[PDB]
Amino acid sequence: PTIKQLIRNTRQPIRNVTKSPALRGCPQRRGTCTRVYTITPKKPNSALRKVARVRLTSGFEITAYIPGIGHNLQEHSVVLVRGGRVKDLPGVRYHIVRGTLDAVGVKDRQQGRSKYGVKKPK
Amino acid sequence: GKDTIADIITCIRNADMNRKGTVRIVSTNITENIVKILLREGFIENARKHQERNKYFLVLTLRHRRNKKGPYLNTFHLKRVSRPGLRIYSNYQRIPRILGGMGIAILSTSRGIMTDREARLEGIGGEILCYIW
Amino acid sequence: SRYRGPRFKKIRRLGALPGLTNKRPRAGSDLRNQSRSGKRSQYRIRLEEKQKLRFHYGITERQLLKYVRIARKAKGSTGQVLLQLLEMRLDNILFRLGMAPTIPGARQLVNHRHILVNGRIVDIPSYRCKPQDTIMARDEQKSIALIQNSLDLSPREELPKHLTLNPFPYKGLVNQIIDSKWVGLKINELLVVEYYSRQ
Amino acid sequence: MVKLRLKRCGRKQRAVYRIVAIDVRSRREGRDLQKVGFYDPIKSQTYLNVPAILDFLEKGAQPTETVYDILKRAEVFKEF
Amino acid sequence: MRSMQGKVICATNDKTVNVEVVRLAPHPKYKRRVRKKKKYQAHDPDNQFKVGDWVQLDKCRPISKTKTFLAVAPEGRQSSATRPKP
RNA sequence: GAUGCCGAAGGCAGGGCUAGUGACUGGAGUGAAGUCGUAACAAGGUAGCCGUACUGGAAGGUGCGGCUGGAUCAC
RNA sequence: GCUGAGAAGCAAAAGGAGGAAUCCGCCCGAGGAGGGGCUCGCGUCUGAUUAGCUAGUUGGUGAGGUAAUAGCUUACCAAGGCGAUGAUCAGUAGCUGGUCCGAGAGGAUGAUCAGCCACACUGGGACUGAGACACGGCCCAGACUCCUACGGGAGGCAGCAGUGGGGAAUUUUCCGCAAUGGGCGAAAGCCUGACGGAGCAAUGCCGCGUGGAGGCAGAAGGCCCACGGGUCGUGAACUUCUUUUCCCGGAGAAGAAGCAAUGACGGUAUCCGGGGAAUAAGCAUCGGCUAACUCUGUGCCAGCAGCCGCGGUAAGACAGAGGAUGCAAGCGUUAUCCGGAAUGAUUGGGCGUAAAGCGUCUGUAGGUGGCUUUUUAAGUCCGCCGUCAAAUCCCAGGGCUCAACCCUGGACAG
Ligand SMILES: [Mg+2]
Ligand SMILES: [Mg+2]
Ligand SMILES: [Mg+2]
Ligand SMILES: [Mg+2]
Ligand SMILES: [Mg+2]
Ligand SMILES: [Mg+2]
Ligand SMILES: [Mg+2]
Ligand SMILES: [Mg+2]
Ligand SMILES: [Mg+2]
Ligand SMILES: [Mg+2]
Ligand SMILES: [Mg+2]
Ligand SMILES: [Mg+2]
Ligand SMILES: [Mg+2]
Ligand SMILES: [Mg+2]
Ligand SMILES: [Mg+2]
Ligand SMILES: [Mg+2]
Ligand SMILES: [Mg+2]
Ligand SMILES: [Mg+2]
Ligand SMILES: [Mg+2]
Ligand SMILES: [Mg+2]
Ligand SMILES: [Mg+2]
Ligand SMILES: [Mg+2]
Ligand SMILES: [Mg+2]
Ligand SMILES: [Mg+2]
Ligand SMILES: [Mg+2]
Ligand SMILES: [Mg+2]
Ligand SMILES: [Mg+2]
Ligand SMILES: [Mg+2]
Ligand SMILES: [Mg+2]
Ligand SMILES: [Mg+2]
Ligand SMILES: [Mg+2]
Ligand SMILES: [Mg+2]
Ligand SMILES: [Mg+2]
Ligand SMILES: [Mg+2]
Ligand SMILES: [Mg+2]
Ligand SMILES: [Mg+2]
Ligand SMILES: [Mg+2]
Ligand SMILES: [Mg+2]
Ligand SMILES: [Mg+2]
Ligand SMILES: [Mg+2]
Ligand SMILES: [Mg+2]
Ligand SMILES: [Mg+2]
Ligand SMILES: [Mg+2]
Ligand SMILES: [Mg+2]
Ligand SMILES: [Mg+2]
Ligand SMILES: [Mg+2]
Ligand SMILES: [Mg+2]
Ligand SMILES: [Mg+2]
Ligand SMILES: [Mg+2]
Ligand SMILES: [Mg+2]
Ligand SMILES: [Mg+2]
Ligand SMILES: [Mg+2]
Ligand SMILES: [Mg+2]
Ligand SMILES: [Mg+2]
Ligand SMILES: [Mg+2]
Ligand SMILES: [Mg+2]
Ligand SMILES: [Mg+2]
Ligand SMILES: [Mg+2]
Ligand SMILES: [Mg+2]
Ligand SMILES: [Mg+2]
Ligand SMILES: [Mg+2]
Ligand SMILES: [Mg+2]
Ligand SMILES: [Mg+2]
Ligand SMILES: [Mg+2]
Ligand SMILES: [Mg+2]
Ligand SMILES: [Mg+2]
Ligand SMILES: [Mg+2]
Ligand SMILES: [Mg+2]
Ligand SMILES: [Mg+2]
Ligand SMILES: [Mg+2]
Ligand SMILES: [Mg+2]
Ligand SMILES: [Mg+2]
């Protein structure tokens, strides 16, 4: 407000806080699943969601969502995780890229296939 | 009365918004010159001087109400610029012009007070006192 | 990088598009289901305008965009300058000179090295034509035959005053820069300029 | 010492040189004191601004072979 | 360039003075002017200058780990000498 | 060749700063459903709130001052 | 010439070519330009839950030392120096031309390209030398690897390639000195993983293609349908034209510079002929924002989601189909930064009840401060000069068929 007051450095920005601290400034990271299990969604959304706990290369442990329908992942599997938030499940800030490393592609998905890591059918 | 210029301006703005033709202001080299200029631009009807107890008062007649007091399409705006807190100056190529030139900008320069028009003719910059609509 | 799809179709949805098709659309036969989207969002009006432009000249978007940047740069009225730029394309001039049936035709003509601009072969469609320029067919049997048959069998004498055509050798000549009234379509450039405020 | 030589500009396969007065220890495209000539093989374009050339040859600037013979063709060694 | 005028804060040391120079600068963002004050070790042979003095400050070779500046007689200043009143 | 001064690791010793970890413990947050009560919002069933002291399983209670962001009645 | 008030004292050399002329050198001064060394104004991140820090420290003399000024060193004398306008301490960081974004004001950043600094296994020394405290030099200490006949040695890819390892992720143990630039040489020339080029990769930006014209309004099929018909769709099939690209043959550069010769790229760029529609379209989305909609399958399940939120029997929001829409050799998802955000506000906000006026005064630094004349000219303004490297951005031309890209010239800002 007062000029004299601004000249004392009274305007300072709020810095940009990341939504995915565990990645540490990366598009993806690789990790190993410590556990694979289901959680119930915050009400009123009832379902059973497929989440794994993944221990990363950057050392962290997180809880990543697994997309699509059904999966082959089990403990001591090596997967690739990416960012993005599942508004349902408290604390789950990361997905698991399908079709890479140890996660296979979703079976028999015909539409938007690149999002699930599936070949084109001939 | 920390700022004298701003105060004159204000007395006008106020007397204007209240639909009075007549204002008392306190005179000064600055005041007087500004009012002269205001007259030669034509924003104001008539000026005159008064004296009592070694005090000088310029009374200003003001442009009559616009075809009634209730229905006013136009007001007469004023704005202080360079003020004690921050003094604004401009070179020749930054000289302000107001609403494409409909309004006027007052400048104090080495050659005295003037409008932006004069400053452009003579090629001079200086301290920008105020704007007028 | 070219639109090889169904044409009539784009025409039903956009409007009238000369540089695409000479066949007037079917009655439209949508009068059965009577399906509409309701009306068009202001956005959809703008979008359809741009699309009109884009398919009339056979330009890709990423290209159109760069034309628009060139346009905002240029000192002058933006929509007008844009329309200039689009209308000066070699293939389009080749078309409006009746040296071609349609723009995909004219484009093909240019691609296959059948045209000369001032005694030199230019095979790229988007070559910008500048005033005082010579548009010739290459002197071979094929080139001449193409240009002859497509020029003669099409009667249209609408030549837009900046374009000269001369009879036996078939020398076309670009005289000057386009006028906004001589433009090749009915478009308010205003709408397109507006669509592009966000780039 | 000060050398009058070519610095290589333009692109891959198409090469175009400037003729520059620069200390011999800076890199081939590095910073210089003065820009003087322009040279190019393919366009057969060559020309020089001689007042500068002479003012440097005078203070002891040594040219490089190619340049030497460019100044020869343009008759700067006669005036010297 | 232009030499720096200032006033003496400390005379106590030998062949030296400690000057304060005040300058105004237009602060980078907010366009108002500000007084920044800097101190200098000025070399003054003969020790002619006392505390409170208004002295012009000049540049020469290093005399010390600090003093680079020659203390020099006040350059031009408005006479505090009374003038006529017409 | 020897020797003096200065001398890098190396040694010891106490400092400052921070990193990890630790029996147990204090509270915080989210958990439809559990227990106890019903403090608050209507004069919320003893008007409410702020400070403070004492006590109570717990929300709380009372004292002392203050305020209306108090209802009813007075106009 | 150097020391010195002087008297005086003190200091140099190198020859090799050629038959000779002559050439390249050598020593001492005195200049020039360029390259370095120093000194100072200004500008040069976050933290007060970091408040006092400094004793060769701040100055003075005398002796030393340095290529040169200097606490650079040392002895003596004096008590200064810096600090709430943030010293010291902790934390992060190479800096600048620039790049990205912004209507502008300004925000974020510092790859390639160019300048400067710093470093060379981890620390410390010096020596040589015009120049180093020296990446492919020396010495020592340390850590690590190798060779050894066991007594001893050898080494330093953050040079070009390359291997392991870490990692979401970043290429060939390539050709050549032909061009430009360097080193040495009288020259002939030799050496150059600088550089010039190739190879690999849709990493990005730009260009072009995957056909053009005609095509009963008749037929198969998908999908929808109140069974009337609609729609995929002039779309395909089908008939002709064309050949950029593809294929098979031919010729074939400039880049080389003034004696000829000399080309890694390459028999590549380009040019002439012969075939032939022939060799080449995917990816997101379709509830609102947001362009684009229906039907079958599921039933708070399986799943979607950027946010609101969808999904319990007919789902325009799930999955499939058909259809449409957007872009297009790319299309999406994630990460990062600015925008939108007037959401840290100078331009550009607020504080009675929404977050927000210290409980109230007195007052130090600091900021602002009435009128009149004069002075001065620090701000301020106007003119002229120097500079703010080239490249980039901006304007005007020119060259690669165009564009990207390159080249010439010039300039507003500040
Ligand atoms: Mg944001
Ligand atoms: Mg200024
Ligand atoms: Mg493209
Ligand atoms: Mg499609
Ligand atoms: Mg071509
Ligand atoms: Mg914008
Ligand atoms: Mg030549
Ligand atoms: Mg609790
Ligand atoms: Mg519970
Ligand atoms: Mg109660
Ligand atoms: Mg109660
Ligand atoms: Mg109550
Ligand atoms: Mg009690
Ligand atoms: Mg009691
Ligand atoms: Mg009470
Ligand atoms: Mg009270
Ligand atoms: Mg001797
Ligand atoms: Mg011999
Ligand atoms: Mg001899
Ligand atoms: Mg910076
Ligand atoms: Mg001492
Ligand atoms: Mg660092
Ligand atoms: Mg903005
Ligand atoms: Mg790098
Ligand atoms: Mg570099
Ligand atoms: Mg190493
Ligand atoms: Mg030496
Ligand atoms: Mg060094
Ligand atoms: Mg070396
Ligand atoms: Mg090495
Ligand atoms: Mg390497
Ligand atoms: Mg590896
Ligand atoms: Mg790995
Ligand atoms: Mg080799
Ligand atoms: Mg060479
Ligand atoms: Mg050479
Ligand atoms: Mg030589
Ligand atoms: Mg290279
Ligand atoms: Mg390939
Ligand atoms: Mg490519
Ligand atoms: Mg390729
Ligand atoms: Mg890719
Ligand atoms: Mg890559
Ligand atoms: Mg067709
Ligand atoms: Mg052919
Ligand atoms: Mg030759
Ligand atoms: Mg051919
Ligand atoms: Mg819509
Ligand atoms: Mg979806
Ligand atoms: Mg997003
Ligand atoms: Mg239902
Ligand atoms: Mg059923
Ligand atoms: Mg259903
Ligand atoms: Mg039905
Ligand atoms: Mg769906
Ligand atoms: Mg489909
Ligand atoms: Mg902002
Ligand atoms: Mg403000
Ligand atoms: Mg607000
Ligand atoms: Mg409240
Ligand atoms: Mg409040
Ligand atoms: Mg108060
Ligand atoms: Mg208090
Ligand atoms: Mg007070
Ligand atoms: Mg005071
Ligand atoms: Mg004052
Ligand atoms: Mg005053
Ligand atoms: Mg520049
Ligand atoms: Mg141009
Ligand atoms: Mg051109
Ligand atoms: Mg230029
Ligand atoms: Mg300037």
Curated annotation (Swiss-Prot), chain A:
GO terms for molecular function: rRNA binding; structural constituent of ribosome. InterPro entries: NA-bd_OB-fold, Ribosomal_uS12, Ribosomal_uS12_bac. Gene3D superfamilies: Nucleic acid-binding proteins. Component of the chloroplast ribosome (chloro-ribosome), a dedicated translation machinery responsible for the synthesis of chloroplast genome-encoded proteins, including proteins of the transcription and translation machinery and components of the photosynthetic apparatus. Component of the chloroplast small ribosomal subunit (SSU). Mature 70S chloroplast ribosomes of higher plants consist of a small (30S) and a large (50S) subunit. The 30S small subunit contains 1 molecule of ribosomal RNA (16S rRNA) and 24 different proteins. The 50S large subunit contains 3 rRNA molecules (23S, 5S and 4.5S rRNA) and 33 different proteins. Exons 2 and 3 are cis-spliced, while a trans-splicing reaction is required to link exons 1 and 2. This is Small ribosomal subunit protein uS12cz/uS12cy. It comes from Spinacia oleracea. The gene is rps12-A.
Curated annotation (Swiss-Prot), chain B:
InterPro entries: Ribosomal_uS8, Ribosomal_uS8_CS, Ribosomal_uS8_sf. GO terms for molecular function: rRNA binding; structural constituent of ribosome. One of its GO terms (cellular component) is chloroplast. PROSITE patterns: RIBOSOMAL_S8 (PS00053). Pfam families: Ribosomal_S8. Keywords: Chloroplast, Plastid, Ribonucleoprotein, Ribosomal protein, RNA-binding, rRNA-binding. Coiled coil: none annotated. Component of the chloroplast small ribosomal subunit (SSU). Mature 70S chloroplast ribosomes of higher plants consist of a small (30S) and a large (50S) subunit. The 30S small subunit contains 1 molecule of ribosomal RNA (16S rRNA) and 24 different proteins. The 50S large subunit contains 3 rRNA molecules (23S, 5S and 4.5S rRNA) and 33 different proteins. PANTHER family: 40S RIBOSOMAL PROTEIN S15A. Belongs to the universal ribosomal protein uS8 family. This is Small ribosomal subunit protein uS8c. The lineage of its organism: Eukaryota, Viridiplantae, Streptophyta, Embryophyta, Tracheophyta. The gene is rps8.
UniProtKB/Swiss-Prot annotation, chain C:
InterPro entries: Ribosomal_uS4, Ribosomal_uS4_bac-type, Ribosomal_uS4_CS, Ribosomal_uS4_N, S4_RNA-bd, S4_RNA-bd_sf. HAMAP family: Ribosomal_uS4_B. CDD domains: S4. Residues 14-42 are annotated as: Disordered. This is Small ribosomal subunit protein uS4c. Belongs to the universal ribosomal protein uS4 family. GO terms for biological process: ribosomal small subunit biogenesis; translation. SMART domains: Ribosomal_S4 (SM01390), S4 (SM00363). Component of the chloroplast ribosome (chloro-ribosome), a dedicated translation machinery responsible for the synthesis of chloroplast genome-encoded proteins, including proteins of the transcription and translation machinery and components of the photosynthetic apparatus. The gene is rps4. Residues 88-148 form the S4 RNA-binding domain. One of its GO terms (cellular component) is small ribosomal subunit. Keywords: Chloroplast, Plastid, Ribonucleoprotein, Ribosomal protein, RNA-binding, rRNA-binding. The lineage of its organism: Eukaryota, Viridiplantae, Streptophyta, Embryophyta, Tracheophyta. One of its GO terms (molecular function) is structural constituent of ribosome. The keyword Cell cycle does not apply. SUPFAM superfamilies: Alpha-L RNA-binding motif.
From Swiss-Prot, chain E:
Component of the chloroplast small ribosomal subunit (SSU). Mature 70S chloroplast ribosomes of higher plants consist of a small (30S) and a large (50S) subunit. The 30S small subunit contains 1 molecule of ribosomal RNA (16S rRNA) and 24 different proteins. The 50S large subunit contains 3 rRNA molecules (23S, 5S and 4.5S rRNA) and 33 different proteins. Keywords: Chloroplast, Plastid, Ribonucleoprotein, Ribosomal protein, RNA-binding, rRNA-binding, Transit peptide. One of its GO terms (cellular component) is chloroplast. Component of the chloroplast ribosome (chloro-ribosome), a dedicated translation machinery responsible for the synthesis of chloroplast genome-encoded proteins, including proteins of the transcription and translation machinery and components of the photosynthetic apparatus. GO terms for molecular function: rRNA binding; structural constituent of ribosome. Belongs to the universal ribosomal protein uS17 family. It comes from Spinacia oleracea. GO terms for biological process: translation. The chain holds residues 58 to 143 of 165 of the full protein. It is found in: Plastid, Chloroplast. This is Small ribosomal subunit protein uS17c.
